[PDB]
Design a binder for these strands. Structure first.
Lengths: 10, 10
DNA sequence: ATGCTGCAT
DNA sequence: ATGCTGCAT
């Protein structure tokens, strides 16, 4: 995710 | 992937 | 160290 | 049934 907690996605 | 064999990703 | 996701062939 | 992506905090 994010980053943090990529995207989603990428 | 693709689809097929989405993306990656999505 | 954590933390989601999407279908054509 | 079978493919895989990506970093700030």
């Amino acid at each position: 995710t994010x980053p943090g907690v990529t995207x989603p996605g990428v």
